Design an enzyme around this catalytic site. Structure first.
Site, PDB file in Angstrom:
ATOM      1  N   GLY A   1       0.809  -1.201   0.000  1.00  0.00           N
ATOM      2  CA  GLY A   1       0.000   0.000   0.000  1.00  0.00           C
ATOM      3  C   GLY A   1       0.846   1.257   0.000  1.00  0.00           C
ATOM      4  O   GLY A   1       2.075   1.224   0.079  1.00  0.00           O
TER       5      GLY A   1
ATOM      6  N   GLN B   1       5.808   4.217   0.927  1.00  0.00           N
ATOM      7  CA  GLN B   1       6.465   5.496   1.184  1.00  0.00           C
ATOM      8  C   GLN B   1       7.367   5.425   2.412  1.00  0.00           C
ATOM      9  O   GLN B   1       8.461   6.003   2.419  1.00  0.00           O
ATOM     10  CB  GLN B   1       5.421   6.604   1.333  1.00  0.00           C
ATOM     11  CG  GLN B   1       4.682   6.895   0.037  1.00  0.00           C
ATOM     12  CD  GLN B   1       3.714   8.061   0.134  1.00  0.00           C
ATOM     13  OE1 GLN B   1       3.259   8.579  -0.882  1.00  0.00           O
ATOM     14  NE2 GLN B   1       3.389   8.472   1.353  1.00  0.00           N
TER      15      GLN B   1
ATOM     16  N   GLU C   1      -2.218   0.380  -6.967  1.00  0.00           N
ATOM     17  CA  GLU C   1      -2.217   1.567  -7.801  1.00  0.00           C
ATOM     18  C   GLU C   1      -0.771   1.949  -8.084  1.00  0.00           C
ATOM     19  O   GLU C   1       0.080   1.847  -7.193  1.00  0.00           O
ATOM     20  CB  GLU C   1      -2.957   2.719  -7.104  1.00  0.00           C
ATOM     21  CG  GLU C   1      -2.520   4.107  -7.523  1.00  0.00           C
ATOM     22  CD  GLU C   1      -2.588   5.097  -6.381  1.00  0.00           C
ATOM     23  OE1 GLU C   1      -2.793   4.664  -5.228  1.00  0.00           O
ATOM     24  OE2 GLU C   1      -2.430   6.309  -6.635  1.00  0.00           O
TER      25      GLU C   1
ATOM     26  N   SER D   1      -0.217   0.133   6.312  1.00  0.00           N
ATOM     27  CA  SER D   1      -1.148   0.882   7.139  1.00  0.00           C
ATOM     28  C   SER D   1      -2.288  -0.020   7.598  1.00  0.00           C
ATOM     29  O   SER D   1      -2.518  -1.101   7.051  1.00  0.00           O
ATOM     30  CB  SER D   1      -1.715   2.082   6.376  1.00  0.00           C
ATOM     31  OG  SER D   1      -2.461   1.665   5.238  1.00  0.00           O
TER      32      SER D   1
ATOM     33  N   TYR E   1       3.349  13.846   4.940  1.00  0.00           N
ATOM     34  CA  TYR E   1       3.815  12.463   4.976  1.00  0.00           C
ATOM     35  C   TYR E   1       5.333  12.386   4.922  1.00  0.00           C
ATOM     36  O   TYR E   1       5.932  11.491   5.529  1.00  0.00           O
ATOM     37  CB  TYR E   1       3.209  11.666   3.817  1.00  0.00           C
ATOM     38  CG  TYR E   1       1.749  11.309   3.998  1.00  0.00           C
ATOM     39  CD1 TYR E   1       1.232  11.022   5.256  1.00  0.00           C
ATOM     40  CD2 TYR E   1       0.887  11.261   2.909  1.00  0.00           C
ATOM     41  CE1 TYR E   1      -0.104  10.696   5.424  1.00  0.00           C
ATOM     42  CE2 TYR E   1      -0.451  10.938   3.067  1.00  0.00           C
ATOM     43  CZ  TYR E   1      -0.940  10.655   4.325  1.00  0.00           C
ATOM     44  OH  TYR E   1      -2.269  10.333   4.482  1.00  0.00           O
TER      45      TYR E   1
ATOM     46  N   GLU F   1      14.870 -13.521  18.247  1.00  0.00           N
ATOM     47  CA  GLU F   1      15.121 -12.884  19.535  1.00  0.00           C
ATOM     48  C   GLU F   1      14.169 -11.728  19.808  1.00  0.00           C
ATOM     49  O   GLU F   1      13.988 -11.359  20.973  1.00  0.00           O
ATOM     50  CB  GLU F   1      16.569 -12.397  19.614  1.00  0.00           C
ATOM     51  CG  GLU F   1      17.594 -13.514  19.531  1.00  0.00           C
ATOM     52  CD  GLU F   1      19.006 -13.030  19.794  1.00  0.00           C
ATOM     53  OE1 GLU F   1      19.179 -11.821  20.057  1.00  0.00           O
ATOM     54  OE2 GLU F   1      19.941 -13.857  19.741  1.00  0.00           O
TER      55      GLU F   1
END
Ligand SMILES: Nc1nc2c(ncn2[C@@H]2O[C@H](COP(=O)(O)OP(=O)(O)OP(=O)(O)O)[C@@H](O)[C@H]2O)c(=O)[nH]1
Ligand SMILES: Nc1ncnc2c1ncn2[C@@H]1O[C@H](COP(=O)(O)OP(=O)(O)CP(=O)(O)O)[C@@H](O)[C@H]1O
Ligand SMILES: Nc1nc2c(ncn2[C@@H]2O[C@H](COP(=O)(O)OP(=O)(O)O)[C@@H](O)[C@H]2O)c(=O)[nH]1
Ligand SMILES: [Ca+2]
Ligand SMILES: [Ca+2]
Ligand SMILES: [Ca+2]
Ligand SMILES: [Mg+2]
Ligand SMILES: [Mg+2]
Ligand SMILES: [Mg+2]
Lengths: 53, 425, 437, 334
Positions: free
Chosen positions: C10, C15, C71, C140, C224, C254
């Site tokens: 996504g 990003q 997309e 997300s 963002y 671990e």
């Protein structure tokens, strides 16, 4: 304040301080994915039937 | 993600023409199809509404439909008339006589397959078609009757695509014929079933805004279409320019439509200033007017209902921080007017490119339960005539029966009660 | 040496992934073309940074990463970005239409048609691993792809890679930057389906990152880009032990051993300090005690909550910069006598400490000032259940009226999946209750 | 226009507070489930603190300190005083208490009871969570809670030879300033204190409910068995030749500070995403040596009828208006 497991290298060091003692199978997934696809196909056929009327 | 635009009937083609004039100016497109802008934000999502043909010219993805050539002849000789693809002019000769049955069942049926051929050709060239937008009135015959017939056949051929309409609602204050409530009631039921988003544009509200606010003593249809053109540009900003919120038709629907039938929106625009026009506005002023009833286009009082969802779009170079706090100010000051069972139902978007002639503007898209006042108004006008079967012969002469009118009346009453259910819950 | 594969799903996942891999190259001295001058073994390697980077014969260091989005607009930014030479086309996977903020659309409708392509591209990277140890999945909660397609991938990863570990970096929804009203729906739906398939998950609330960017960085309207450069710092300080020489959190196993004693309670809280604005020409350099003290201030946590009103199951301290154990011990001792640090009875009250001498790397021209020492605390506290409570409450409000449910049912999802997901979250909140009170 | 919600309809204090907020024209009450509020007057049980401070553009304040229950429950208070070094087990202003489960300290309470029988000292204890007995057996059997030493020699107000306790109202704001209400009350017994027959708990329990149900002289020496500070100060001057400030109030202010400062690191909302304030009700007892003892702390107290208006207005000015702008308190500095 007990320091244990001190490991040192050139990049840094690490240690521990203590303060006080104390799946679905591939078939089952494909079954659910195709069940949802069949419900989509069923809803689309009913819409086309409704539009045919 | 291409959108196919369709404009049907006199009102749909006149409002559709202005819409293409306005957004072609915003995207730097001239009446010949050539680009002459100074920013690449104009071209980043130009393919949503424009096809790029040979010669680096941009052709609108627009289909012009009418059962009478008169209005579309005026469009072809209009300002941007040459920008439209000549093959996308699909018209008949008989007209529809402000008759839904003629548009939907007889005259329109003869022409609809040729429109769908053009729709199909525009869709075959789309990399990934996302849906359709239709501009039309509900009070006439072609836009109302043939428009809703078009929507039904498009849905049958493209069941997985989003259907969006700009629907002009009739009002006795700006009326052409007395049968408009019949035509509007028949087509509202079609929209309930076969569109995902419908912007309800009330001609009464457009008249009152032109008269009371814009200080236009004698409003014309051209003055009403000025408001619609500005509103349509605002509500499609998030589709035409880069952004994060409501960037396509399906995400807009998901954010705005909590129940499938309740997809009828109240649009709003600000500033609405009489001609002063040079006075600069502030962000608190834009936000106050945007939520004011006098800036709404549906002639419904939002304080008579509750907001299910709200989309807000600010255009221009402004303080994004001050935008956020004014939006929160509106909600936190009048939180009784937003349903509490949909948290954070108010989504805000900002676009740097302002509309022509303004440094700042705000566009309002609300899904309010007060829209039931519009459908109740049409329902009362419908019943006042249908109770005496007045003017029905125009429709029974085209093969319709009284039963179909009774069912359309019950459907719109059901829709009104469905809004009443969620206004108190 | 055991390799790790990063998966970015996504827009948010992609990003954030681009910000982390940019930071990794700066930390390891990898040029945007993929060359690494400090790497004397050309064409191959067996050391710590090779867990995240493969090597070509031409000496190019290639991220062990796959990017997937329904997309193409976000991944195309990677294809032309500063580090475009790092990746080859097979690592980037795009569709034509996205999931439209709809879990069911991402999981069932579009997920079914693309899941086999993603797994094939992952298998190609896995076939280049000598001893793959598992996956790091960035996504997300609120997006249709980040939520819906991720849960499908985590299922197929448990099938095709049953012995491998799976860690998540998950973005919790915040209305100040959220793009959908149904994000509470998608968050709870994807947590229900992924819970059994994730061994350790680091949640990041955009609200917390948003305010840290406003207060500490003096950014009035964080974008963002501002958020991701800060999140990349946290993720880098979490994965640093996999990419550098050390002895704490040296493999993915671990992470579960040191932070997750109870399998369903696998959401450790992260706290990072100091965050100093680069616009300040000078700043007083905080001490070891001052940055360690800030680890117990709620204003520095990735999820705003109150650890005082919960109980700790584990606590790791990850230092970067000029830090020696003596100052860490003296900082912890003074903090115990001034703060509420209550552990569960079946766990020892203590801290596992890792120190990397290299100070944190800042992106040149970024918002974060370079500091001489920094710390990231990973604490598994029951207080993080406050985030589940807020989310479940919003779910309950909309679902009581079935608002927006038709969008999910329309994609083939049964309405009962809503109820199954909500009941699982109800059991999850009860688990935190009986452990933390 | 600030906004607030009400989630405890049975609160007499904050019912007046909300009434005052509406009467300022700058506050609007929302529905109880509307999250877009500035101020929460929350419910007593299971207040959702975790949902506060997550509303963009809203400074949110609540009328309860999360974690203050450690001080406002009998069992947790005894644990807090013994465990915390600030108060210590050698605390002098708190009666010797032991937590008894029906960890459990049943062996320590008997070890102290046996120690008292060894010295022939006053071995009268009280249990509550009420039975006053001189034998440890009758107390432990009744539980199957906490048992503390009963003050066998309390200060007796004359005329009447009667018992009394002192209620002090304390307001702690979001900055953790401690404000002591200048107007306290004395819940007096209207029956003569009787060292014999400790089961006749009409002269032994100063509860307004018991004195309004079993006391024959209820409403004789003072209306509602409630003596304010002015009369009690005049009595101490005429009788004991001292003042309320010196003999009692200094110890009261000392106890309030010690209790609230001890829990400040656990409940302070200094750098938290939401702010807290809370009204407290401290209950004190006085012995014949004019030494003050702490009985309990109430987290949701009810005011006296005369003071129901002054204090509630003080709560708006000090705790609410200081955060949302539009002295009857003694600030205890720390
Ligand atoms: N921190 C951070 N959050 C982001 C970023 N991008 C999106 N988000 C958040 O993620 C949520 C939306 O999910 P997305 O990742 O954008 O959606 P998606 O996974 O691409 O799924 P679809 O677009 O519906 O197909 C919102 O809460 C955003 O605020 C980002 O770059 N950084
Ligand atoms: N250790 C002790 N010594 C002497 N008297 C005591 C005592 N403990 C309690 N009492 C008497 O018993 C009464 C009630 O005690 P308790 O602490 O249970 O208050 P309570 O919770 O029942 C009602 P409130 O909310 O008003 O405090 C006190 O007012 C006091 O007169
Ligand atoms: N706003 C607006 N409304 C119009 C316009 N033209 C017609 N109408 C309205 O549309 C209805 C008449 O339908 P019309 O489009 O003219 O007939 P059609 O060609 O059969 O679709 C009436 O309610 C008119 O008030 C216009 O240019 N602008
Ligand atoms: Ca004909
Ligand atoms: Ca190498
Ligand atoms: Ca597993
Ligand atoms: Mg006409
Ligand atoms: Mg996306
Ligand atoms: Mg009590």
């Amino acid at each position: 304040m007990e320091v244990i497991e001190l490991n040192k290298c050139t990049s840094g060091q690490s240690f521990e301080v203590i303060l006080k003692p104390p799946d679905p199978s591939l078939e089952e997934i494909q079954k659910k994915l195709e069940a949802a696809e069949e419900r989509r196909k069923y809803q689309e056929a009913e819409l086309l039937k409704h539009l045919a009327e | 993600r291409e959108i196919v635009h369709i404009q049907a009937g006199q009102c749909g083609n006149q409002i559709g023409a202005k819409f293409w004039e306005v957004i072609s100016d915003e995207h730097g497109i001239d009446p010949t199809g050539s680009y002459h802008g100074d920013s690449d934000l104009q071209l980043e999502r130009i393919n949503v509404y424009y096809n790029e043909a040979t010669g680096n010219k941009y052709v609108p993805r627009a289909i012009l439909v009418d059962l009478e050539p008169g209005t579309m002849d005026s469009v072809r000789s209009g300002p941007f008339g040459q920008i439209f693809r000549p093959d996308n002019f699909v018209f008949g000769q008989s007209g529809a006589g402000n008759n839904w049955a003629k548009g939907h069942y007889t005259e329109g049926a003869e022409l609809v397959d040729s429109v769908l051929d053009v729709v199909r050709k525009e869709s075959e060239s789309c990399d990934c078609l996302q849906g359709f937008q239709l501009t039309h009135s509900l009070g006439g015959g072609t836009g109302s009757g043939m428009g809703t017939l078009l929507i039904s056949k498009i849905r049958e051929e493209y069941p997985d695509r989003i259907m969006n309409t700009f629907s002009v609602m009739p009002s006795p204050k700006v009326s052409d014929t007395v049968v408009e409530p019949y035509n509007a009631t028949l087509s509202v039921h079609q929209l309930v079933e076969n569109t995902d988003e419908t912007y309800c544009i009330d001609n009464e509200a457009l008249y009152d805004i032109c008269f009371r606010t814009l200080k236009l003593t004698t409003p014309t249809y051209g003055d009403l279409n000025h408001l619609v053109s500005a509103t349509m540009s605002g509500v499609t900003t998030c589709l035409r320019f880069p952004g994060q919120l409501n960037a396509d038709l399906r995400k807009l629907a998901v954010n705005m439509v909590p129940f499938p039938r309740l997809h009828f929106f109240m649009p709003g625009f600000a500033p609405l200033t009489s001609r002063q026009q040079y006075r600069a506005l502030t962000v608190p002023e834009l936000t106050q007017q945007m939520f004011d009833s006098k800036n709404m286009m549906a002639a419904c009082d939002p304080r008579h209902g509750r907001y299910l969802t709200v989309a807000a779009i600010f255009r221009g170079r402004m303080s994004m921080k001050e935008v956020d706090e004014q939006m929160l100010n509106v909600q936190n000051k009048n939180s009784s007017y937003f349903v509490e069972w949909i948290p954070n139902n108010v989504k805000t978007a900002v676009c740097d490119i302002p509309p022509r002639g303004l440094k700042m503007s705000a566009t309002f898209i609300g899904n309010s339960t007060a829209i039931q006042e519009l459908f109740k108004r049409i329902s009362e006008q419908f019943t006042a005539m249908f109770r005496r079967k007045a003017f029905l012969h125009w429709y029974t002469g085209e093969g319709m029966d009284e039963m179909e009118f009774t069912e359309a009346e019950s459907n719109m009453n059901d829709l009104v009660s469905e809004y009443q259910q969620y206004q108190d819950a | 040496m055991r390799e790790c594969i990063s998966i970015h799903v996504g827009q948010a996942g992609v990003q954030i992934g681009n910000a982390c891999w940019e930071l990794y190259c700066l930390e390891h001295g990898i040029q945007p073309d993929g060359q690494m001058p400090s790497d004397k073994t050309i064409g191959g390697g067996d050391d710590s940074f090779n867990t995240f980077f493969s090597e070509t014969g031409a000496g190019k260091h290639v991220p062990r990463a796959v990017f997937v989005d329904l997309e193409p607009t976000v991944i195309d930014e990677v294809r032309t970005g500063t580090y475009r030479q790092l990746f080859h086309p097979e690592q980037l996977i795009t569709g034509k239409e996205d999931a439209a903020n709809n879990y069911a659309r991402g999981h069932y409708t579009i997920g079914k048609e693309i899941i086999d392509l993603v797994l094939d591209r992952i298998r190609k990277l896995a076939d280049q691993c000598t001893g793959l140890q598992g996956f790091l999945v960035f996504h997300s909660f609120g997006g249709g792809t980040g939520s819906g397609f991720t849960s499908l991938l985590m299922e197929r990863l448990s099938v095709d890679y049953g012995k491998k570990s799976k860690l998540e970096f998950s973005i919790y929804p915040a209305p100040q930057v959220s793009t959908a009203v149904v994000e509470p729906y998608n968050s709870i739906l994807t947590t229900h389906t992924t819970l059994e398939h994730s061994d350790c998950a680091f949640m990041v609330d955009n609200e917390a990152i948003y305010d840290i960017c406003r207060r500490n960085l003096d950014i009035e309207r964080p974008t963002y880009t501002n958020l991701n450069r800060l999140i990349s710092q946290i993720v880098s300080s979490i994965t640093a032990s996999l990419r550098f020489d050390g002895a704490l959190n040296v493999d993915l196993t671990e992470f579960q051993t040191n932070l997750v004693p109870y399998p369903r309670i696998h959401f450790p809280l992260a706290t990072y300090a100091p965050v100093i604005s680069a616009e300040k020409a000078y700043h007083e350099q905080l001490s070891v005690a001052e940055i360690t003290n800030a680890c117990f201030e709620p204003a520095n946590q990735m999820v705003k909550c109150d650890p005082r009103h919960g109980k700790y199951m584990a606590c790791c301290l990850l230092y970067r910069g000029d830090v020696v154990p003596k100052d860490v011990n003296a900082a912890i001792a003074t903090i115990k006598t001034k703060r509420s640090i209550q552990f569960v009875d079946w766990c020892p009250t203590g801290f596992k400490v890792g120190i990397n001498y290299q100070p944190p790397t800042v992106v040149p021209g970024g918002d974060l000032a370079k500091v001489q020492r920094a710390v990231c605390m990973l604490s598994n506290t029951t207080a993080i259940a406050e985030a589940w409570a807020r989310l479940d409450h919003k779910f309950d409000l909309m679902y009581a009226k079935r608002a927006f449910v038709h969008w999910y049912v329309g994609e083939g999802m049964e309405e009962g999946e809503f109820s199954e997901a909500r009941e699982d979250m109800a059991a999850l909140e009860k688990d935190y209750e009986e452990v933390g009170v | 226009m600030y906004t607030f919600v009400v989630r405890d309809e049975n609160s007499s204090v904050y019912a007046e507070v909300s009434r005052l907020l509406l009467a300022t024209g700058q506050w609007k009450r929302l529905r109880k489930d509307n999250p877009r509020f500035n101020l929460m007057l929350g419910e007593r049980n299971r207040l959702p603190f975790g949902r506060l401070g997550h509303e963009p553009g809203l400074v949110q304040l609540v009328n309860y300190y999360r974690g203050a229950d450690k001080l406002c429950r009998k069992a947790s208070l005894v644990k807090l005083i013994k465990t915390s070094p600030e108060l210590s087990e050698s605390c002098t202003w708190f009666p010797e208490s032991y937590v008894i489960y029906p960890t459990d300290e049943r062996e320590v309470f008997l070890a102290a009871y046996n120690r008292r029988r060894e010295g022939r000292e006053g071995n009268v204890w009280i249990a509550k969570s009420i039975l006053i007995s001189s034998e440890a057996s009758e107390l432990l059997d009744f539980i199957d809670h906490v048992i503390q030493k009963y003050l066998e020699k309390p200060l007796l107000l004359e005329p009447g030879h009667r018992k009394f306790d002192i209620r002090s109202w304390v307001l702690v704001d979001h900055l953790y300033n401690i404000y002591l209400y200048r107007e306290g009350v004395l819940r007096t017994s209207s029956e003569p204190y009787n060292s014999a027959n400790f089961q006749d708990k009409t002269c032994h329990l100063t509860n307004h409910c018991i004195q309004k149900e079993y006391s024959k002289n209820y409403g004789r020496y003072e209306e509602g068995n409630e003596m304010f500070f002015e009369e009690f100060n005049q009595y101490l001057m005429d009788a004991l030749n001292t003042t309320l400030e010196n003999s009692i109030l200094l110890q009261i202010k000392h106890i309030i500070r010690s209790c609230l400062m001890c829990i400040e690191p656990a409940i302070s909302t200094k750098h938290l995403h939401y702010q807290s304030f809370q009204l407290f009700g401290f209950d004190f007892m006085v012995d014949e040596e004019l030494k003050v003892w702490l009985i309990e702390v109430n987290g949701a107290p009810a005011c006296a009828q005369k003071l129901y208006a002054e204090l509630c207005q003080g709560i708006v000015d000090v705790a609410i208006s200081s955060v949302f702008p539009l002295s009857i308190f003694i600030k205890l500095h720390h």
